[PDB]
Structures are given as C-alpha cells and as structure tokens.
Design a protein around this ligand. Structure first.
Ligand SMILES: [Cu+2]
Ligand SMILES: [Cu+2]
Ligand SMILES: [Zn+2]
Ligand SMILES: [Zn+2]
Ligand SMILES: [Zn+2]
Ligand SMILES: [Zn+2]
Lengths: 128, 128
C-alpha cells in the first residue's frame, strides 16, 4: 500500500488538495505538510488537523485561545486524531498516526486551525 | 486644518503609509481605508485600528476570538480609540473620532487586527 501523502499550503490561505485518500490496508498513515511562499508562521502559519467532520469547527474555536505555542490546539483535545505543528514559509512537518483510529462509516475531515483559516482551509478524508 | 487622510491596504498585506499625522488643532479626525487588489475579506481582509502603541498586540490577540463579524475586536475593548470595519477588495470604510482622546506625550499607533496581519501592517500616529 501507499501510506503517505504530502499536502502543500500557501500564502493565499489554501491547501493544494481538498481530499486526502487513506488506504484502509495501511497500518499507519503519514501526512507531510509543506508551506510554499514567503510568509512566516505568525502571519500566515498553517497546520493540518484531522478530526470528525462535525468536530472541526469546535476544535478550531477551542484552539484560538491556545496560541501558536500549542499549535493553535487545546492541549489534550480528545477530538483531534492527528495534527502537524503550525509551520511558516519554507518549513515542513509530518505526522504519523494509526489508521485504526478512523472508524469506518464515520465522516472525517482535515483543516487548518490557525485563527480564521478554517473557512478556506478544510477538506475531506476518504478511506479507500 | 486638514483633518482627514486616506490609507490604502493591499493583497500584499500592507498599508500604503507607515505614519498618520494628525493636526492637534483638529476637533475630529477622519481616517478612510480602502482595499485595492482582488482578494475577498475572508482571505485578505483589513481594518485599521488606532490605540496606544503598547496596546496594539494585546488588542489584536483579544480580537482573535471575536471573529470577522465583530471586526476582529473584542466588544467594548476600552483600549481601542477608533477603528474601521474589516473590508475586502474594492470596499472602503471610514471612521471619525475626537482628537481629544489622544494625549500629547503618549505614543499611539495604527494596525490591522485581522489574524496574523499586525506584524506586517502597523505604523505610528504622530500629532502635529
Ligand atoms: Cu492555515
Ligand atoms: Cu490586514
Ligand atoms: Zn471546548
Ligand atoms: Zn498535539
Ligand atoms: Zn495645528
Ligand atoms: Zn467598535
């Protein structure tokens, strides 16, 4: 199986994809996030966070007050299945998680939790 | 006296001035803000906020939770002297305030409180 994907994020507040396909055959899956462009992380930082589709906005709202030091995520948030750091231009991060965590028949999505980015920066996770 | 100034804001996350000079003789001062370029407000929205220089970042941090519907400013934040709405490309807005609110000898600045913009979008307010 192919159990890795790389997603780019930009100065114009977008990801380069709207769906991440995860082979159910995979034991673990690795998401690598890169940031093209020139803006630093405190201006236009992006992370990639995976959760239940219905949990994305609640997580993002709870992340606002956490600050960039905690990757704009509330510490110990149980709704977060996996997430990268907040990265700025020229940086990259990756996260590897157990594919078992994704309940078949449940709807999953990815988003950026930097304040206000979720409106433009989200997508679906599809198990294949 | 001249008691009005126009400031433009860009897709490049910049104001087209670094200083706003306010004549002390003015009873009121009016700041008009425009937005050139083509990006919508949820991507590259800008407002213009006036406060004490030391207060700019705390105000901006507090504004994160207020959201774009509240112009990214906490309601009733007493540290805010004056502010425009958040505007997107092709829009404009203006604010008029009493110049007596400026204490000569105190240092004032202007900035944009849209998430992440402040480090790239701020300047001084100079009384003349
Ligand atoms: Cu982002
Ligand atoms: Cu701005
Ligand atoms: Zn909560
Ligand atoms: Zn974490
Ligand atoms: Zn004068
Ligand atoms: Zn107000």
């Amino acid at each position: 199986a192919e159990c890795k994907v790389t997603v780019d994020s930009t100065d114009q507040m977008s990801f380069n994809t709207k769906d991440i396909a995860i082979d159910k055959s995979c034991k673990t899956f690795t998401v690598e996030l890169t940031h093209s462009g020139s803006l630093p992380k405190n201006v236009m930082g992006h992370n990639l966070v995976i959760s239940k589709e219905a949990d994305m906005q609640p997580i993002a709202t709870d992340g606002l007050s956490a600050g960039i030091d905690k990757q704009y995520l509330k510490d110990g948030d149980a709704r977060v299945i996996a997430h990268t750091k907040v990265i700025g231009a020229g940086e990259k991060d990756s996260v590897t998680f157990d594919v078992s965590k994704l309940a078949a028949g449940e709807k999953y999505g990815f988003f950026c939790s930097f304040p206000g980015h979720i409106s433009m920066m989200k997508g679906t996770v599809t198990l294949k």
